[model samples]
Structure formats: C-alpha cells, structure tokens
Target: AIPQNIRIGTDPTYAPFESKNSQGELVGFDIDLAKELCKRINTQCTFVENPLDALIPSLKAKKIDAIMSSLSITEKRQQEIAFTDKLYAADSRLVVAKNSDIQPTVESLKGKRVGVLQGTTQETFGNEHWAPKGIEIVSYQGQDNIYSDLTAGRIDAAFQDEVAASEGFLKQPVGKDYKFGGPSVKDEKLFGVGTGMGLRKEDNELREALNKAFAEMRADGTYEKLAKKYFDFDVYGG
Candidate 1:
C-alpha cells in the first residue's frame, strides 16, 4: 500500500533546517527528519534540491513527491497543495545589526531594503505588510545571499524564521554583529499553523502514512531526541 521510492524536494539554502554541507551533501534538521519519516513508511527518500520559489510549482509539475523544505502550512498554500501533519513551529522575525535602530514596524522599515528568500512566507508578509508603505523588499535566491548582503550593509535587515536566523547566522561568526530587532511575528494566516511536509492533494495515501510516522516519532520521543541535535528550544512550538 506504500510506494517504495519518494522524491522529496528541499531548498538547502536554509542551514540548520535544510542546507548543504561543504561536501555538497544535504544535512540538517529537515533532512534527518525526512530520512526518518521515510524509514517509518518503509520507503526510499531521494532528496531533490531546488530554489525556494520553485518548490510548489515543481511539486505540481511532478518533479518531486514531497517538500521537506520547512514549508509552512498556511491556509493559502493549503488551497493549492496538501500538507502532512505539523512537523514543527516557525515564527518569523527581523534580523539586523545589534546596535541598529530598525524595528519590524512599517515606520521603521519604510524606504529600507529588507532581504528575504523569494517565494517564502517572509516575502509574502513583507509585500503585504511593509512594501505597500515604501518598504523595499529584496528577494534573494538563497538565505546565504541575504546574510552576506545583510552583513555588507546592502540590505537594512533580513526577515526570516527566528530559529533559522539564530542558529544559521547569529550563532555563526558571519553574523556576530547581528541580532533580532523585533518580536516574533505569529499571524496564523500569514505564517501558518506550523511547518509540514508538503504533498499533492491527490496523494492522500502518502500524506496519511507520513502523518502516522510523524506521530510515532513524537510519541516515542524520537522527535525530541533528533530535534535536540540541532535546536535547544522546543521545535514543536510548545
């Protein structure tokens, strides 16, 4: 009743969640999580890398089986594609120079360029909330570019998940001079209920199997065990 092979698409630009190592191998929270899920489902996982913006279209194009790119579970996406049970929670935030005067508000961000990964929830939020009032939303092909631009002072700030900014940049030497400038944004309509494995609506069989595997991972404490490897905080989002 289960497929033997699965092609899971992932954008490996976001480290700690999903990113490539120096060896060009995929490694991170989502990678491990997906591998585990595949094991539970008794299937094979072939990770396909793509840009963040192309995930949904590629899914519909039949380029991949599931998206394990920390894709959020927003209501809008739900209309176009189906998603498995929640994997973890992700709240967006503004990352900037520690001594800067920028805030997440429109007044503070107006006329300022904010770098965000193209086609992400962060970009959608910025376009809807900040861009209308003169905020310049700069979309990037990858998070690494945003961090480089942010440090070089090209962009005033970067908008993304709090934990990603924390572990991927702030904790690393490249982000030594940066810190979060505002409170976490948590509008369910914009951000989503939580992160999940995106699947095609017609592929309910895999969705159900994946959900059951995820619950087993949680119930047996395997989720907490694996999550602790990358994040110290509760990735399940309380």
Candidate 2:
C-alpha cells in the first residue's frame, strides 16, 4: 500500500544537491525533486537530516523511507539496499590548490595528504590505490569538512564528485583558489554506475513508483528545468 507520507534521509552539507538555507530549512535540488516525486505519487514527503555515512543504516532501520542524499548506485551498496533508476551520472576527480602542481597520479600524490568524505567511493579508491603508494588518505564525515581542511592547508588535495566539487565548492569564492587537478576517476568497481535514490529491498513498489515519477519529469522537461537552475551542463550525462 502507498504510504501517506514518505520520509527521505539526506545529508544537508552538499550544496546545489542537498543543503539547508539560512532559515535552517532543508532546500536544494534533491529537496525539490523529492517533493515533486511525492506529488506525482500522491503522497507527502518529509526530509530528515542524516550524516553522510549513516543514511543506509537509517533506511534499513526504518528511520527513513528512502535516501536521496546523492547516494550513488554502486554494486557494494546494491548488496545492502535497492535503488531507483539512475537520477544522474557523477564522475570523481581531484581538487587541489590552483597554483599547486599536484596531479592525481599515485606518484604525484605520494606523501601528500588527500581528503575524502568517509564512506564515499573516493575514500575507497584512496584506500585501495593511493594509500598503498604512500598517499595519506584522511577521511571526514562531510564534504564541507574536507573543503575546510583543504583550504586550511591541513590536506594537500581532496577527491570528490566532479560536479559537486565544481558547483558546490570550486565556483564559490572560498573555493576560487582550488581547481580540478587530474583526469576523472571512473572505476565501476568503486564509484558505481551513477547516482540514485536508495530504498529498502522490500520497497520495490515504491522504487518503481519513484522511477515512473522520474520518467514523467524527464519527458515533461521538468528535470532539465530544475537541473538548469543549478548547473549549466547536463547533469545526467549521455
């Protein structure tokens, strides 16, 4: 049966996707998208703040009906939870000081400290590829914290989603001194196929319903309209 209201878990630190406004109200692309999807499904929607690493646990424990906090659809994650259709494609990249000469290669980053959000594919990639080569992988609970250390010189570089790093940080004044420093990271084994909403395995009906809502939005140009508000290029790449 369709629930009267669906609660979604999100980390409000990622701007342009999910974040809180000055009024302390949750607002962003994911927020608007969730509300639109709920409307199409004839259900109310509520967003609950969750730590980036705790979203899945919260969903499994029924603390939230779903997770829409830019959760990527990865094989490792698939074993723990079901996901809606691909909402967008995200590629990982490295961000470094604009004037710095650091590249993303293991040799280039060797002995340098790299910041990554805990529980993210970037962290996994660092642990698997960089750490073994002498890169210091520092994990944080939020992207904002990673940026904080990056700016404070606590870390030499940061690995994160290209779009998020570009729009959420690089475009901002505080991030103006940073720029993408290397080729995109695209390991399917670590980064997954794309981004999607996470749900419980038993919520197949809700998953299908949400997918249908996404299809309708895409067909009607609503998705593009909303996306253009925050990004100039296609967020759901071909």
Q: Per-model C-alpha lDDT, please?
A: 0.73, 0.73
Worst 10 residues of 2 by lDDT: 229-238
Once model 1 is optimally superposed onto the true structure by TM-score, how far is the C-alpha of residue 42 displaced, in angstroms?
Answer: 0.4
- CA deviation > 4 Å runs, candidate 1: 21-25, 92-160, 173-185, 236-238
How far residue 196's Cα lies from its native spot in candidate 2, in Å, is: 2.5
Q: TM-score for model 1?
A: 0.65
Tens-digit lDDT string for candidate 1 (46-165): 988787689778877888877777666888888888887576667766767766788657687777787879976667776777756887888899757888898888988776665665
Give the TM-score of each candidate. Answer: 0.65, 0.66
Highest TM-score, which number? 2
**Ten consecutive residues with minimal summed lDDT in candidate 1?**
229-238
